[model samples]
Target: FEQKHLAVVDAFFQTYHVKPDFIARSPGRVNLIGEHIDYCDFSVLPLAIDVDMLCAVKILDEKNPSITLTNADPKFAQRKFDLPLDGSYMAIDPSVSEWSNYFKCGLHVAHSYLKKIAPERFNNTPLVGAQIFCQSDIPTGGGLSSAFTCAAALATIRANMGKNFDISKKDLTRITAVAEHYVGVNNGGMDQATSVYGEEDHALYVEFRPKLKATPFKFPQLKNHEISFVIANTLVKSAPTNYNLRVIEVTVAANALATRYSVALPSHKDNSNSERGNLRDFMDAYYARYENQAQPWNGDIGTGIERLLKMLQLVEESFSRKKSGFTVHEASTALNCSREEFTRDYLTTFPVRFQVLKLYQRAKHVYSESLRVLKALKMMTSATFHTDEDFFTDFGRLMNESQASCDKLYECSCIETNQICSIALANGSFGSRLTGAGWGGCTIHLVPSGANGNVEQVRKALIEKFYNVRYPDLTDEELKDAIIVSKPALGTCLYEQ
Candidate 1:
């Protein structure tokens, strides 16, 4: 990480003709379950992953904020964002709006918030502006917090630069969200919160009530069980990474139901006893009314499958990408749209509903499948990694259900992920799921029973056949190249200048 940092810094100087002030980062989170609940004040259990974004910032005498991207690859310099927010700063013409928008917006909010919170921080300071360069390993458009990591990293760097200005966790969280919001995507605040407030060596249970707070709890022990989780990305790229209009649409539908029932939304998070059954009743009814749907299993299983599909179609048509295939285009669009829609429609009201909508209901199969995960972990931690045949078989079933449900409900499983899941299931060793946001990405799976020898080779075979058969339309390189088998990773943090 350090070697890469130094190289990136040198590349920045060569490309942008400037030095850096400080380097900071923010991380992506993996939600165990309880999806879409952050807005509704519902409980979401997300642990910060090791993947993150890092930015090297240098205070500049100029008025604008510039950035450089480097990878020993195509060194690209995004035009600077100078001038006041009302003047030359606004880069109109949609074609030019790129990832730099998020960076500039983040700095803008951080700068403004710092001025309001601690005016003295910028008083008579030589720091006219900043030249920031970013490097990241987080996968973009993978239902991961890569963009959030970049935005929050910029904000954190600015905050630390101003000695007198100290943005609280809430302040930083809000700043990140505000920046992302201005970019035209509606996202839950959880991504920012996770990236900003991650703690090392512990699973973070963040509660989305008044603000962000974490409970350092270890995952429960699971020895006698046998299961493993695999995250698979569909290799689909979604737009509007922040705004999810589908979530909003769902919320609007829920509110319409409330209007009919004359029930109010739960005002405060503490009022679990409140009588706001409008959303609950509406959700129950929506599924009941639509459960008889066809493929993709759009019924009341709470998968958000139907809504996501529809939203994807809407976005695809709007973006002129409708000619593409359904899952290829639709799933990608829905990832972002559904995220925003969930926040606008559910989070702003009950928040918890978002959790059910995304994690619990939509990912129902995963939640139940988590049990097998725990059991497998128990077997590993307890040093019983070899025995327990029945546990192994049950574990395989749960994993099958998990992948099947995703293929059926989440509607992201491609031939590759399915193939990967199939190979693991046929073997009695472990369970797996397509981890990352699914379109045509990788899959996570447990090693087969007794086939633990050369795990990598086993996984390679799985991918070779999996992608070949699953996507016969694509070339072997495109389909088979997507598969990867690896162990779980760590969290994101800062690096020395």
Candidate 2:
């Protein structure tokens, strides 16, 4: 696949009468267990996949500072933009969805920071001109981080262009995240980190609370169990509005809770209230303030779905109204703070207004999902597996519960996503759920042992039962392309010509 990608890129440059200096490759990622908790300042488990984006580029010797970007896919037309060598450059238009905007984000972010890091690189010589071409196999709008991966690759290339200048994987991840924010989504660092620090055959445990960090751990290779993931695309593109709204809703819930209980928000104006606010801390404070307990209020939760559900029920009852849900006025009244204080201190940055139940449910999703992620990761890395099936049995249950939370609590799942998960379970998958942004995209299934046609059985069932009925017009070849079986893949890297 790498050779094929390079061949297409090489052909593209040759056709365009340009010689490439190097290539950048970055992989799209899938969250194995964790979902929607990365931005809530919780740890998430994800890994890169086989599908990737590739960029070929060469620094030009033109006197006029400019950059030209082309796509190997003919659908995306060529785009040319000027780059002023000086620190001043045009701000990226967030409303634009052109292919080049993603790259422009990288250029804009790198140029912005270059002055601070290495003033001489841009101040003296500057990145005057360049020619870039991109090709990607990653399915866009299918829950894969296509834009994020491209932005990471472009950022990596920008960081490498200076003398004695190197960016660590961690820094690159952070930088890439900032770049992606320029494209109109306030995303966390998980997608960028997954593209930058992903390890082959291992899932990454990424934490964003204290600070952004990723730890890669290998999955259990049970003697009698063969673990495989079957990713089924629902052929539905993600709606950016839904993604943005969910983030805002969750933040609203967190803010409302913080204000209601006087829990210190991360950016509270009161300097004395320095504690950070997130779903984890919010839940802890809930247990402490309401139950008058120091800790252990949940009491040996131990990854029980019913226990988590019960806790969430109590939270809903305690915080929200029965019929009308919780309102901003009610929250402020409960906290004994003005509406202005609650809005300013807790909902400082976001421009979203919300209903109480939606906000509470969104926060509930984050709290429960965070617990599920920790439990899932712990169970995966535990060495107390009596059998291969034992590991899947426990891990699979968590995956199913994660989906339930996404569906019921987060309200992010669609009919197709739910149906796909149900089909996967009926087809012998241990567990399955909507994998990405969750409005509609792909469902990741944990298949049992790889040997003796176990995975094949599940694949066949999905294609025959779900794909055939749903996508009647698609040929078997097209159907096969939609259903993919993948493993953990390496992260962002550069290829020398």
Candidate 3:
């Protein structure tokens, strides 16, 4: 680690003619099971992968600052942009995708907040300009939220520019989550929360709503078995429509359900919160009003499994598939609102083209996926696995079930994703599934960890059975980069000079 920092500093000085004050790094994450539910205000389980973005930062004192970014990798060319001195946002051309847009978003949002709270930091100054010497080992399409870039940039800005005030991890996490929107993707906050709150030897269960928070819990250990998570990149570029379309689908589904259940809106929030409730939120509201008076489903001394099962039962009893789907009129009629309002609320934010909003399938996926998330949480936090079969046996099946739903009902899985997961499962991996937003990214597998166990053996099988068969001309180094082996890692931190 010291050598890596030394390399960063030496390279940074060569380009900027200045020694870096500090280095910032934030890890990428692998969502173990929770997929696409975070946007629905449900808890998600994920851990930080070791791969990260490292930045050697030099804070500059200049008026009407312009930020310059230099990348260690040749794939991304050097990029820079001037910050808006009038307290306006830097104009990011959405037409073209720039590697530096990640940094731009981070610097802009962090700068916006600091100027608000600690206005003196910007008063009478050459505003804060930054020289970012960036290096990363994280793969672009490996399901590692590249939010690592957004995360690292936000931390670097907070540490250097916002140094006058102390911001908690929770605050930083919230800021990073907002930073994602600048790049034009409406994220669910799971990736940023996991990246910011990650821990060693533990995965985080992150929640959004009444309050946004991350709680880490140690993974379960087996009596006589060992396991590992293998991340395999599909080598396919991701399209943003998968993310935006799902956002609409789930949001509208929650709206329809809330209308159906008569679940009232909360005090203040986003699409997932104040405007409407996610599946779990609506379930709790409905039950609190009718089923269980004056309390949520998970009352004092209540187990999460009971709540999950009840929610699943409600979804099963209510939602039903349609030949087509709910049109704008049908949806508004159910929500007890005008079609004009529905279009303004849901369709206006994103101009995505969809004939109908499919609620039954989406609602069902959210409910069942929620069940699996809590079930996994329960198995890990308690001693229920002591006398059972190996932990991976049952847990892997849960992950597999999750992938099936993501593929079939959620319709997020692509051809490559399904292929990689099946290959992993065929090669003795206990379970395998796509890990991210899912149209195209990486798949994680739960496999045995031994010298000759499925971990190493599965790699060979992938090389021979999958990669070799698909891309017959793959190089040795290319094969190595295609698959990743990771354990839970720590959150973002600064290494001071």
Top lDDT model = 3
Query: Residues 1-497, candidate 2, lDDT per residue (tens digit)?
Result: 76856685676577568667767777887888777876655567888877777777676777776777777778888888776655465557767666676676666566656656767765555565777777777764322344444443454455346433556787677667766556655446667778778877688877664566778878887786666788888877753346655765555566566666665543423211114455655655655666565452232325334345655675576554533455778666655778898678656764554565366667677777877876876676779998877877788899999999999877789988888889888878888988877788778988864565368888888888877888889986577668877677888876656
| Model 2's TM-score against the true structure | 0.79
Minimum summed lDDT over a 10-residue window in model 1 is located at 351-360
- List, residue by residue over 1-497, the lDDT tens digit for candidate 1: 55767876886687668766666666655554433333433334445655556666665555443333332324444556444533223343334665555555655565565566556754333224555667665553322333443444454445345544444666666666655456554445555656665655444555543344545444323344312333334454431212242234334434443333344443433322113432333433433455543222211222443343432332233323322322312332443346455345344642231212232223233223333333333333344334455444454455556566667644556665666666755642356666434454445555532233335555555555554455557765454434433222333344455
Worst 10 residues of 2 by lDDT: 266-275
Model 3: lowest-lDDT 10 consecutive positions:
293-302
Show pairs that collide, candidate 2: 226-449, 226-450
Candidate number that wins on TM-score, 1 or 3: 3
TM-scores for candidates 1 onward, in order: 0.59, 0.79, 0.82
lDDT of each model, Cα atoms only? Answer: 0.46, 0.68, 0.73
- Which sections of candidate 1 miss by over 4 Å? 13-19, 32-42, 62-78, 83-96, 120-127, 141-156, 159-170, 199-201, 209-216, 219-230, 236-417, 424-429, 434-455, 468-492
- In order, what is each prediction's RMSD in angstroms? 11.8, 5.3, 4.3
Query: CA shift at 349, candidate 2, in angstroms?
Result: 11
Ranking by TM-score: 3, 2, 1
Give a tens-digit lDDT track for model 3, residues 137-172: 777543233455555556556555555555677877
